């Protein structure tokens, strides 16, 4: 399972969508010269769970604060498909993660 940890990133694009019946919200992270990192989450049996909404609200909080972010992503085998983000971290305000 190839997963990536991207740190000192900030999110510029944040989209709320409808993937078939289920939901997905995709975010884009931007470093000074590194490549853009796109990732998003989906409701796979989480129709009654609140994990999706909690993580969406956390992504909103990170976006509004314009903070650096540490995001872990699992990548699709097929190029062109944004990966799935598993863990999100807000770095210290007006600061950079370790």
């Amino acid at each position: 399972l190839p997963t990536h940890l991207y740190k000192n990133f900030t999110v510029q694009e944040l989209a709320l969508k409808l993937k078939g019946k289920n939901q997905e919200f995709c975010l884009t992270a931007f470093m000074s010269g590194r490549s853009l990192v796109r990732a998003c989450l989906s409701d796979a049996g989480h129709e009654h769970d609140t994990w999706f909404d909690t993580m969406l609200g956390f992504a909103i909080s990170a976006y509004a604060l314009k903070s650096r972010i540490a995001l872990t992503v699992e990548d699709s085998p097929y190029p062109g498909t944004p990966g799935d983000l598993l863990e999100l971290q807000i770095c210290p305000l007006n600061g950079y993660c370790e």
Binding site: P92, N94, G95, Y96, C97, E98
Partner: peptide, 11 residues
């Protein structure tokens, strides 16, 4: 604390 946290990142 901003300066100390900057030290922790090495920046």
């Amino acid at each position: 604390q901003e300066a100390v946290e900057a030290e922790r990142a090495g920046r």
